[PDB]
Amino acid sequence: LEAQYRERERAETEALLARYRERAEAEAKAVREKAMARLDEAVALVLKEVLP
Amino acid sequence: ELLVATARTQARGEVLEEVRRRVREALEALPQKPEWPEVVRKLALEALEALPGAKALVANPEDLPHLEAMARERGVELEPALRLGVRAVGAEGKTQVENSLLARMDRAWDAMSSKVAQALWG
Amino acid sequence: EYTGITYISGPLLFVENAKDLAYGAIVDIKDGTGRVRGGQVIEVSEEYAVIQVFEETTGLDLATTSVSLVEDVARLGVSKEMLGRRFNGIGKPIDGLPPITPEKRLPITGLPLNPVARRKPEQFIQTGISTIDVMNTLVRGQKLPIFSGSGLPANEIAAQIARQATVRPDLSGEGEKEEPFAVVFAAMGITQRELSYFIQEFERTGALSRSVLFLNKADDPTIERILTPRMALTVAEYLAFEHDYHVLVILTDMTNYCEALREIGAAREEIPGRRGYPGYMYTDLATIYERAGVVEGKKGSVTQIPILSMPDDDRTHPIPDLTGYITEGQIQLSRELHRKGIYPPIDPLPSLSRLMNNGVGKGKTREDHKQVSDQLYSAYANGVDIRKLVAIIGEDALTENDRRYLQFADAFERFFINQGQQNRSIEESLQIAWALLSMLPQGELKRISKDHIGKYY
Amino acid sequence: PPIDPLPSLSRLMNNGVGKGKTREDHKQVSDQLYSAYANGVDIRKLVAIIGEDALTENDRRYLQFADAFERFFINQGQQNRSIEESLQIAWALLSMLPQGELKRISKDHIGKYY
Amino acid sequence: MIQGVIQKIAGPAVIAKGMLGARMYDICKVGEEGLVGEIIRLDGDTAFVQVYEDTSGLKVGEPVVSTGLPLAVELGPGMLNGIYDGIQRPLERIREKTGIYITRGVVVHALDREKKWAWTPMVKPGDEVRGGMVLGTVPEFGFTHKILVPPDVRGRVKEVKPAGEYTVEEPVVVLEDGTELKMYHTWPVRRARPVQRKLDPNTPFLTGMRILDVLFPVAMGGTAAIPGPFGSGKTVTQQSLAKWSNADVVVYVGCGERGNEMTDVLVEFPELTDPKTGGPLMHRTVLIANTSNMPVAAREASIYVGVTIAEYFRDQGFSVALMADSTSRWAEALREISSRLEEMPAEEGYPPYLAARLAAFYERAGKVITLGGEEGAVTIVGAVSPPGGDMSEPVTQSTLRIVGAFWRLDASLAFRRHFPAINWNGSYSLFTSALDPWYRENVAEDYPELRDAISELLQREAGLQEIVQLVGPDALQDAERLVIEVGRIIREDFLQQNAYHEVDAYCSMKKAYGIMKMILAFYKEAEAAIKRGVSIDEILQLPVLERIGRARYVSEEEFPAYFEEAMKEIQGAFKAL
Amino acid sequence: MIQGVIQKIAGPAVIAKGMLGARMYDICKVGEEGLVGEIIRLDGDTAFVQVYEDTSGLKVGEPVVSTGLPLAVELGPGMLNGIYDGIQRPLERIREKTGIYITRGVVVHALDREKKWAWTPMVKPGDEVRGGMVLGTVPEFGFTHKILVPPDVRGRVKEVKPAGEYTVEEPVVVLEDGTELKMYHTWPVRRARPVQRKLDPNTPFLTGMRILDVLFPVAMGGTAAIPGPFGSGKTVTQQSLAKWSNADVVVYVGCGERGNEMTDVLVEFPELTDPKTGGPLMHRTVLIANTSNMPVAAREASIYVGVTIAEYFRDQGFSVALMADSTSRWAEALREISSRLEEMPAEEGYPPYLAARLAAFYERAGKVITLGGEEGAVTIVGAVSPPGGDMSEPVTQSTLRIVGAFWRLDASLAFRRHFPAINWNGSYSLFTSALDPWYRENVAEDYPELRDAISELLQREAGLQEIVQLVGPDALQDAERLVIEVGRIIREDFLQQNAYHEVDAYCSMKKAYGIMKMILAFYKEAEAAIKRGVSIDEILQLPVLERIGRARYVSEEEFPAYFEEAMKEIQGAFKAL
Amino acid sequence: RVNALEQVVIPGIRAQIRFIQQVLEQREREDTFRLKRIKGKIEAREAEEEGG
């Protein structure tokens, strides 16, 4: 009875992780693109306060 | 939740390090932009206004046309071998308070890590 | 980069050309080992200063020395998202990935909390040890040191409190399960076994994605044994108060703390004044413990659990000294119940309690253990004490009456105080408790009322 | 001379001694004298505690060995005893203990001096 | 002027230089945010500044301008109802204007001038005034909070403002002496308010427990003390003067009361209602305690700024109950001074100033009639602890055991059910021969007789106690278990009281009187039980022992009728059997 | 070069002037003699030296030479049979040159550069090397020696010489990074060899002690104290603990070991069997032991030599045994050094920095996987010494801040000539449940079970011992005396492990488990036997008592012949009787 | 009682005072040593007014 409960759970606790890995990766890309088109703006902010 | 957190950090890093890349490119061509005389005097300024007496001032001899005002203010400029900073050496003894650009760039995530991030991300 | 030494020996340095430094200031320095260490300006002077390096000197020549005022006050970048991440006493994450970006950079010295801003708590938790949740009642915003001897375990017992820490869902009349419950850790000196032992019970806990770990090892500097405490608690302040979560903080190895405290004690100018330990010790154990407390207007809280490890079973020793006084309600472990195999080996007979009918045992804390606590005390006493008195009076001499006393000793202790991997709810406690109490006829059971008896018959 | 060996404990007891480096039975009679007295003095504790006794008949022989080791052996004045004279007669006090109750000395030595 | 800057900032203390005109033990303004220092040494132009607030950013070359006041306490109304510091800064003003966190360099009014108070004059403009004379009556709740003329000042009046509110700063009586009597007036903290004479204590103070009076009596106008090693019930024993004291003025002040202990005790007062007042408990509590969240050097100030407040009250003509919560804390703060100043204190870990500043604190006020004709009584109770766990040390002997009452606590003693606990023998009272008059006349002419008679029995059992732990009783006789069981009942019901329950204790003559008469009864008959041939075994098994064992739960109001019905049952279940 | 001279001399310490450019911790040759000290405290430009060798005949003004490079110990081939002592020299060689006595000021190199060994390449040019990886094997005795790349060294390879013997300082592998990577390499003593990932122990540690291991084990990688009051068992149990070992390498640091003890130690090793070459145990030992005749700091240094050697062998992938003898060494070192260098002592002569290096030395130890990617483990057995005769001493309380396993040797058991002397009421272990996997996998399934089944016996013996001394057990019932005389055999023939009989000097799991089932039998039979009315009196006379006593009259390697044999008669011939 | 008294009890109740005593006493070495160095500071300070 244990034998058929374990393999049920195992086969969902891989798939669930797998799906989360596709969101993870894509939301990694989604924080990149917001910053990279407001990137020049940051660099102006760094320049202005290193010259004192 | 941990594999999400980690992946965001790795990407977030790439953006922080990439602003430093862009800022260091600026620094290599900073004497080439014509705002270079304005930068060198304010850095040399803070060095003398502080604790040092300015018994000696040490910058490159090709930064010497841009700090000859301050040759006559305090001491004399004789090289850091940087072309991107100004040492000043006090008369209280050895002392030495160095205002270099490299140091401040590097400390621009060591004292205003928040400011830059909010503009990048929100 | 100021050059000119005068005294170097240990993590206390002195170097001249200074007066631009402030109390509590981050400097950097250069050493002859070709490495850049730290320094807190703990004291300031006329044309020098006292520096406290965040690493042990093992090399520092007098040709090459440096000082650079990084910042005027001394701070650490602290942000909202840093849960799921591990850390060390230096303050670098030990995860392997770029260090997170602050929201506030809060001081590491600590800002005290107003005594006016708190108010009496009354929401109790399940610690999974019966004995506590009856006798002392561990509520939020309350300390309760677990006194531990040397040659005694400290690690074992601690783990039990970490995986069985859980709010009542409405057993008290409410929950706080509606808001995330999370835990914070920070170890102050740990070996090879205590490192891994803690980590593998945190995977039992299922918390390693919502906890902040400030592990300090003994291979890590000895100076960071007293830095890290303050440091850790500022990341408590940030997440309980200003992001409304009930954070459990658990501090262990407050004897390795005291090792590092001693160092500065006598190697600095100051003289000993607490029977061979410092006199500014007080402040060192005040600033630590007094931060914690449920604040009235906040939902969230910092519940601190100190876990001592103090030298032997002396009570004149500095550690249990000040700690006693500070905390309200205490718990002890001994060697009476650690020769019997009873984990945990809590003994409340010498132990004391000062909050158990003080905003607790009444209020939104159940009154059904109100009279029970009072009863259990004098009942458990009748026990333990006469075990001694028997070996003088006779060798087996016990009268009709005293026979009963000692009968309730062996029993209560075995059943009740062996918990460990067994959780007991508020109800489960009281039931069982009363059935060992039926061993004493009416007249010693004066303290429990008419209601109570029948209640839990 | 008053020597009490029971709080006494030496570093070596089989080094610089052995068969032919002292006497063959020196090495044997070492540990023997030690546990033999021990089990005598032990009784004299427990006698006060319960009744006026604390012994059987198999205790009574170890009893007389704490008297025997006493004024005969430990006492001697200042007279010089030889390494022969010592262990030799140390086996006339060990006749009062059962030979079948000896476990701190080997059997092949029981047959050499009884 | 006094001017200078920081030379060497080390620890909470600042050592200044350039100090000109600086005077010993005088308030200052320190740093640039105002941290307030005290000159606690001079060495020419350097003076060791002790800075009550902890340092955290302050550096070399910052201001050090001494005010020139002799750490003066600002006396006036608004004391009643409202938390204050030991350094006197209202905590109300801090919480509202900062946040919930205490930050260094918070400076606000010591005595608020964001309040006004209704004036009733009494004095007439045609009269002259005198030091210690009432100028009018300010009505602060149900109490009478007079306004007095600061000692060493007199003139002749010429005007007196008519009734209305006025700010404590504005005058309300003016004089021909170049001065204006305001409700804002300086009095040093190092100079006591003058007294007319000292009076002999001869009324006792009721501290409303039947073991902190009945057995070891405490005096009104007295001084007393209780110790407590390592958190044995050090804090809990002030839940016995919380409201079960007869004071009309209650001043709760702590040298250092840690964060957790003000989460329950300090919030306890606005959540209670005193029955003597008839009104709230915080109306009658001043509150001027210090936290341990509050800096280490603020702990050292504490004592001298609240003792003067106690005098201000004593003068009006009200019983003052001052109790310094853990006075042991001022000693560590005093002791830290040595370290920082380059000195080494008194040997065996004792503070550098022993008798000098302890004897002074206690005798500053206490059983003294005033200039102004009113009855000053100050009841002061030190709630010390021994730092090393020894009750044999200088500072316990000089002023914590030579007072009215000396008490003690054991660690498994209090755990059974005695909260707070006392040692029956090892604890005495010096004053007890002067508390006999009132107790004779008011209570009964056998109240002093029965209270020595109960104490006799309690300490005579000790006789046998020892032998029990030596080899035991192997012979139980009729005269054996006599003292022994009696004494048992006495320690079981008369010393097990709780301070968390209002049924287990309360301030009431008749409860003390009553309980002690029940026990007298049980005792009385027992001696004549044995003679007849009544086994002590059956003496246990009378239900009347249980009747005396259910007098410590009885309702206060019910007790008179309860007692009368129960006295009869003793005498019936003894003489019959 | 750092060229001072001397300034003052203060006992075996020396202070020096002219010292500029001096780093804290280096090689410090003092006077022209070159005694080898160490630069510790640096005040000003006046650098406090602490000389490991005597300062008789050392004047002031003599030129002091310092390298400005850290003190490092020589690590390379020829390590085994070799001596590195406490002062960086090989005694073997010292013995010959300096004659019968050693004369101070003499120094040579720690590692003999006169040695030659074959080189087997495991690398070629155009390889990529990382710190701690192997470059080649070397066959030194029955052991395999590898040439560990120094940690923090990377880069490509220029050449690698072909096999053949070379001098142990010539380059065998020249790197193409401009570093002729010499055959030996230094690695500072403070610095410790990296680790890729830290792990926890799980392989058992057998040492040849029966009861010792079986009741309170230590893992292979673990740590334990041995506190032994009054010059008892401790001192030569350590010799009997290093006598036999499970671990592959044997590293024995006597840390300034008394010369009269070192005698028997040193000479015993050539006569002890080695189980990988069938000869001198010296083909698997290295002596880091130093002479006690030398000053205090030569006994501090010695511990720091040992560990960086231990690590070197752990990084090649071998189980390493480290045995620090006497914490009485360490204590005395810091005790006296503290005065010398003008340090401020915190408590009882011990410096504030006492558990400083002490803690970390213990820390390093553990089974862990290295940056070389091999697995060794440093296993520790320090012998704790209280100078005062109680554990209340600061030097012994520190050695009890660590955890894992403990052991307690008592003066009283030790007299009876039953070594090891172990107390079931005085130790604990946390390698009981850490070792339970590898028990029921290799040892036996009923070994996590049988160990519990001996403990209960002696649990009840503690509890009952008490009762015994208060009233004899002859007055008590049968079943009380039962377990008492089970107990006899647990000491008579199982706490006596004769270091003079070699069938007790050997012990292993088979002799473990074995005698554990002997005892088991006897217990379960006697409990039922006496419920049939028999008395333990008669049973002492029965042959069954003697029979369990066979554990030191029976062999190690003829043991499975006598095990099963007698086993049967227990359940057989006692239920017939 | 006699037997017992002359062994465990009596000299044991002695050795307790003795052990106590000695540790109280020895503690006061550090007292004097510290106090010594304190003295040294004090004199060193009034020796900078009149010299160096």
Swiss-Prot record, chain B:
List the coiled-coil residues. none
For the keyword Translocase, the answer is: no
**GO MF, one example:** proton-transporting ATP synthase activity, rotational mechanism
Keyword Ion transport listed: yes
Q: Which domain of life is it from?
A: Bacteria
**GO CC term (a single one):** proton-transporting two-sector ATPase complex, catalytic domain
List the keywords (alphabetical).
ATP synthesis, Hydrogen ion transport, Ion transport, Transport
Give GO BP annotations, semicolon-separated.
proton motive force-driven plasma membrane ATP synthesis
- Which family would the database say this protein is a member of? Belongs to the V-ATPase E subunit family.
Cited function: Produces ATP from ADP in the presence of a proton gradient across the membrane.
Protein name as catalogued: V-type ATP synthase subunit E
Q: Which stretch of the full-length chain is present here?
A: 65 to 188 of 188
From Swiss-Prot, chain D:
What is known about what this protein does?
Produces ATP from ADP in the presence of a proton gradient across the membrane. The V-type beta chain is a regulatory subunit.
Annotated S-S bridges: none
The protein's name is V-type ATP synthase beta chain
Sequence similarity: Belongs to the ATPase alpha/beta chains family.
Signal peptide residue numbers: none
Give the residues of the full protein shown. Answer: 350 to 463 of 478
UniProtKB/Swiss-Prot annotation, chains E, F:
- Annotated keywords: ATP synthesis, ATP-binding, Hydrogen ion transport, Ion transport, Nucleotide-binding, Translocase, Transport
Cite the Gene3D superfamilies for this sequence: 2.40.30.20, 2.40.50.100, Bovine Mitochondrial F1-atpase, Atp Synthase Beta Chain, Chain D, domain 3, P-loop containing nucleotide triphosphate hydrolases
Residues bound to ATP are 228-235
The EC code for this enzyme is 7.1.2.2
What is the catalytic activity of this protein? Answer: ATP + H2O + 4 H(+)(in) = ADP + phosphate + 5 H(+)(out)
The UniProt entry, under HAMAP family, shows: ATP_synth_A_arch (MF_00309)
According to its UniProt record, which protein family does this protein belong to?
Belongs to the ATPase alpha/beta chains family.
Q: Could you tell me what this protein is called?
A: V-type ATP synthase alpha chain
Taxonomic lineage is: Bacteria, Thermotogati, Deinococcota, Deinococci, Thermales
Swiss-Prot record, chain G:
So where does this one cross the membrane? none
Its domain of life reads: Bacteria
Q: Which family does it belong to?
A: Belongs to the V-ATPase D subunit family.
Please give the function described in this protein's UniProt entry.
Answer: Produces ATP from ADP in the presence of a proton gradient across the membrane.
**Name assigned to this protein:** V-type ATP synthase subunit D
Q: Please state which portion of the whole protein this structure contains, as first and last residue out of the total length.
A: 160 to 211 of 223
